[PDB]
Write a protein that binds this DNA or RNA. Sequence first.
RNA 1: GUACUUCUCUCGUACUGAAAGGGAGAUGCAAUAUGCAUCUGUGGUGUGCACACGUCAUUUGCCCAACACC
RNA 2: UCGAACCACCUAGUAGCUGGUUCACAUCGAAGUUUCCCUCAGGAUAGCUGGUGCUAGUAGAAGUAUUGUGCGGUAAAGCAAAUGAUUAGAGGGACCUAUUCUCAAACUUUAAAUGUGCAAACAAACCGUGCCUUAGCCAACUGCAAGGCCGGAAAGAAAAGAAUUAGAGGCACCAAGUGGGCCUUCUUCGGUAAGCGGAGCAGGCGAUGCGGAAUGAACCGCUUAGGGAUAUGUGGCGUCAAAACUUAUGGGCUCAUUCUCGAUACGUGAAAAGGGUGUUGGUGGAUA
RNA 3: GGCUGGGGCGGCAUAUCUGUUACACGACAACGCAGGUGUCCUAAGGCGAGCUCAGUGGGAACAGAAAUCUCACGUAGAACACAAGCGUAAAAGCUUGCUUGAUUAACGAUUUCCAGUACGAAUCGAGACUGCGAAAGCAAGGCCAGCGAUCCUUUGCGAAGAAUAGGAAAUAUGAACAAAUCAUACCAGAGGUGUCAGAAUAAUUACCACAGGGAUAACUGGCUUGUGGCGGCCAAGCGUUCAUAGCGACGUCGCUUUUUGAUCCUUCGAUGUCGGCUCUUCCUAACCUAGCGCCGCAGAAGACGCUAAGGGUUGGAUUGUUCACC
RNA 4: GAGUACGACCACACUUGAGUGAAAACACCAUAUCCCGUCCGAUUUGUGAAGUUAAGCACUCACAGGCUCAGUUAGUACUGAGGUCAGUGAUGACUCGGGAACCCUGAGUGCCGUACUCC
Lengths: 54, 197, 69, 158, 96
Amino acid sequence: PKGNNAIPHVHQKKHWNPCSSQKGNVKVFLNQPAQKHRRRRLRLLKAKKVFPRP
Amino acid sequence: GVDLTGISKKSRVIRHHTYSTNPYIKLLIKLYKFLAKRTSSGFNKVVYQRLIKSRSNRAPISLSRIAVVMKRKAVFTAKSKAAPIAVVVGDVLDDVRMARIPAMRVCALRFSKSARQSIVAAGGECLTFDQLAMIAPTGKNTYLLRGRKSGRESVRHFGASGVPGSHSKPYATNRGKETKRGRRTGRSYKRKAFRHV
Amino acid sequence: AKSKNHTNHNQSSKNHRNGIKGPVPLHLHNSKRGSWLPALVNARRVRKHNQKAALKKRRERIAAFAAKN
Amino acid sequence: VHSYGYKSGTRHLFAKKFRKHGAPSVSTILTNIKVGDYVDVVADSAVREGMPHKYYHGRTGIVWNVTPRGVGVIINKPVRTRTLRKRICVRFEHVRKSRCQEAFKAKEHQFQAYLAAKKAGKALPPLKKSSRMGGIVRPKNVEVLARRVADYEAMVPY
Amino acid sequence: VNYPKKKVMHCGDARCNAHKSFKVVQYKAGKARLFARGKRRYDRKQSGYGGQTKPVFHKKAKTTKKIVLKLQCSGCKSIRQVVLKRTKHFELNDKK
RNA sequence: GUACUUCUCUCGUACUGAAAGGGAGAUGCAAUAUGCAUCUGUGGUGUGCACACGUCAUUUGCCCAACACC
RNA sequence: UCGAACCACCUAGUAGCUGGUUCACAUCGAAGUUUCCCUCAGGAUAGCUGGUGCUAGUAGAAGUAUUGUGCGGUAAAGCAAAUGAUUAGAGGGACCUAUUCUCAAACUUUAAAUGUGCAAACAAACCGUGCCUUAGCCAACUGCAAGGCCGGAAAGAAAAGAAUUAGAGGCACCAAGUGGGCCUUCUUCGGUAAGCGGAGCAGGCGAUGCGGAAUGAACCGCUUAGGGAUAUGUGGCGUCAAAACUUAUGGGCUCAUUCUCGAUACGUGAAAAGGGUGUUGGUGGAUA
RNA sequence: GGCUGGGGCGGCAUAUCUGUUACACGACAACGCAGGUGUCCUAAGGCGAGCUCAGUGGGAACAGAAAUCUCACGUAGAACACAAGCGUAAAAGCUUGCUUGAUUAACGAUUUCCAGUACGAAUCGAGACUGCGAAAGCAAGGCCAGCGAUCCUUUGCGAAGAAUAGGAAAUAUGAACAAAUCAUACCAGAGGUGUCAGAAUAAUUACCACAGGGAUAACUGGCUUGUGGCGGCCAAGCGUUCAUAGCGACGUCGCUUUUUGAUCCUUCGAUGUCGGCUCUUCCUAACCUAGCGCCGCAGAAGACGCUAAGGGUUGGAUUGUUCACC
RNA sequence: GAGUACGACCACACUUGAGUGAAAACACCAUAUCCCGUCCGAUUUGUGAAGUUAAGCACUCACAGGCUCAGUUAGUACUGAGGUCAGUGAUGACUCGGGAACCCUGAGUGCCGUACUCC
């Protein structure tokens, strides 16, 4: 490879991109906050049912 | 056509303007672009030269670099006449390695919070460039400083590692990776540690 | 196809296009590591004693100044 | 040069002149070399070990290291865009103190000896003038240039 | 090449620390041992299916071998290994 | 989305050896197989902005950055 | 559909290979070479180039002189000098002696032109019964080596032809394209030669037109922001076709009947040996 | 595998050393020229001392061109392991004596090739113990070509003894501890890649395929003209005689592009690639036809030459033939 | 004016054939117990000093060979720069400049230090 740049070790060889051919092991967190508002809503409801137990 | 080999090779790059989007820097150059023009003083047009240099070329000096340096000048000055001002166009930082700094009246573009307290707590001032135009409009009896630019890790990587007599830090994320040929003397060879030039 | 060509043609025109930079001055790099050693040792054994004497002069010029005023 | 060896190009550069053959004379053993001194590197062929390379023969530089049988010299070798400053190690049989610096260091002495001579005069020798300036010429003999009939039969010998 | 059976060289130890007459013996030695780390690896790679997994060397250009001498210090006990040029016939032979 | 939060985590402040391991200031006195004292300080030398006191661009002072020799 | 069917999929298979790769203007501007590679249609690497720069705008300047001082074995010359070829007669069949004709990329005594190394006053050099320091040298010792210190002077480099400069020196980071070249004066090797093959020092085309040689990549002149004037270069002034409306009040020479006398260098892009009481000159000898 | 005046076969120009090409620094190409290398040497290494070599000439029983002795001359005309160059004469050669500097050499620097990387080889050093020499000094191989990465295998060095503690000084690891094995590590060497900066490698395709190439062959055309063809000049000789009626050797100067080469400029997303038949036209180096000169031209027939391309130039056997033969 | 010892440059010093050499040196020389070395006291090594300038050495000489320097060869050969120069070519002259070599002629035939010594 050309120049003084560092020796790239990126491990992307396995099929990951879901190319029209394949599926590919991609995990995306776009649902992070919606599950943040959900874990809270479910701590409150259990707090509302468990009452008055800590 | 007139013959001028080049003519593209005596010409050099200067860049009067600034590459900074900071609105305050654009005021400070407004001041010195004015008063490096009309002032007839060496100091006052160096800080205008220096005020447009992008962050890389303005390297912070620590405190205790200002102190040590200015304690070297303060010895041979007449005991009657003392008014040196540390004038720095970069950032001034706080040195944990030194305590008990005298009172130096430093001037700078920006002070480390711990660096500014560590001045005034020891009795000095900190005065930024809109003041210093009032105190030293000729730059008179200032003391101008720069930074320390040669210890950066970017300057350390420059140059090839495997060239003889070049001590340079190669790019690797895993340091234990590249030790093993052309570094060790045992197998293929060791790059010569020193080379006459 | 005969690929084995060799020419010097354009070279000294390129070598002078940034010019041939003249040598580095004598004073710039001395770095005597060559070198004939028993003379090199006896050079540092002095070059230490020139530091003491010169760093002493740094002190005698601190007193003599504050002495003057 | 077919083989690109160490001393590949030289049956002449390294040959001794006609009837100058011999081993190195005493006068070149009794010369002494101080560091910093300018020197010619001219390889003597009657001493095998210690020769400089084919390129350095005929160059001049500043001696720097001095070892019991050796010297070392700093010579300018122009390479692609730049002049590297090369350090070579030679047996001093191949080394002669250069006269290059000489006429200059003589111009410096003949200035100072000139200057101490004006200090309290004694006057000074007169300043020589140009030969290119004017004059009347008083010819003692004058001849004619012509192309002679006889000049042509001299140019067709035989 | 005729070479002496006994050579006075130097001995390096503080116990040697002078020229001592040695005993000359040629180095043709190594016997490859199982359980050497590289052999334990070549058996785990070689085992199973697949062909020869490691390159085997055929084209042989050289007719000689460098000659290593094991020289055993007589009064001091260490051995040294001295290397000599390439020769097709090497023989240890007294004075000729 | 913005606003808020920590012990931690991580890149740094220190590096070196295969490893077990070890691990950095200055000055003075001084030579003690961990010497002793002091702590407002560039380890030294050559070159080197600005500043300061001079002079007819430049002497000396300190020299920032930086280059080179130690 | 057969020297391995058909269908869907792995599959947008891989390609150092061919084709394509959409706005403008401005500032700059190349390379076909080096080294390594199962390398030769490709790459990495230095170079060329752009961008960002840093550094105290004459510093460590130079594709050039002059002076001083070094280096050299090509052109020439020599064989009456060595080595190697080599013709003839003479002198004392071979020999011996002195000559003689003729030669050399792998011969040489001698030896250019063009070149090449260094030096030519500010971190330097020069000077001193200066001083300090040494585990350097020596039979010395205040000699020589070295690092300094302190004084001295400094046409800041005279005179002698006795330099010049569109001479800001120096350092660095990042990166593209190129790594098929071709032509020419001169030198030059293989070939009978080549619009052939291969190099050296340079200049060009490549990438660039414009004026000129009718035409031509490279020749000649010239080097291009958009326009006007005056003047010119190479080349031209009978018409084509701007300029002698066919200039002079200039001297000679030339007649050529079917590829048709001759008339743009480079361009054998056409001619030789040999001939001629065609004509026009000259040199030598001779009779009058 | 590769380079390659297409590829193949051959070669080695693939790693390499001396002379030359090479153009008086250095650098410089070809499948340019003339040769080498993969080894060999305990002496052919190291050193001190003595000597002088190749050859020539005079003389000496056998004994001669040539044996051994002796004298004189002897600038190297000899020798130095080998290719070549260079260098050397009280030596660098020869003889002889004693020897192991052909070991170790703290990671010193530098040259050569060059990217100023490595390898190879080499130069200058500093330390140890030495060798020869009265000594100064000389020697870390035989000057300069004679050679080798990562990984893997393999051998050598890290003797014993001591330390109240890891230090100035004891080699480390097996990671919960400790022993003895075993394995590994750090240092220096060896086993080797000759395609020599280092893959593990046989064929055939006319049943063939693909990506491209006019970067590269098989046609034409272009340059060239050795070869083929055609002609001139000179005049030794032939022609009983007489160089030139007609020829014309030894030489020498050209032309043509109807031969074959040489080259590889155009065309490989395609210029239909032998011969005959048919048909037209052009060239002239003229076979017949027109006119003429000359002859070793008496006539007849013909030789040689000049102007001249308007006209003409056949029927068949065999052969695919062009060519060739009847 | 010389000699010897050490020498520097290394023929203006060498080579050949002659001639002459004061003193002191140098040497030839006489010898072989001792040290030492060989076939041979030739070389060499140790002892010494009867004899000779015969030889070496020093010097002079030769229409001598060589060698040194300068002439000449010759502004010829060659060569850097130039041409829309001549020539079919081969090559050549020209313009701004550098500029040789042998034969050939003449002239020269060592010089310079330290130390000790001879008239």
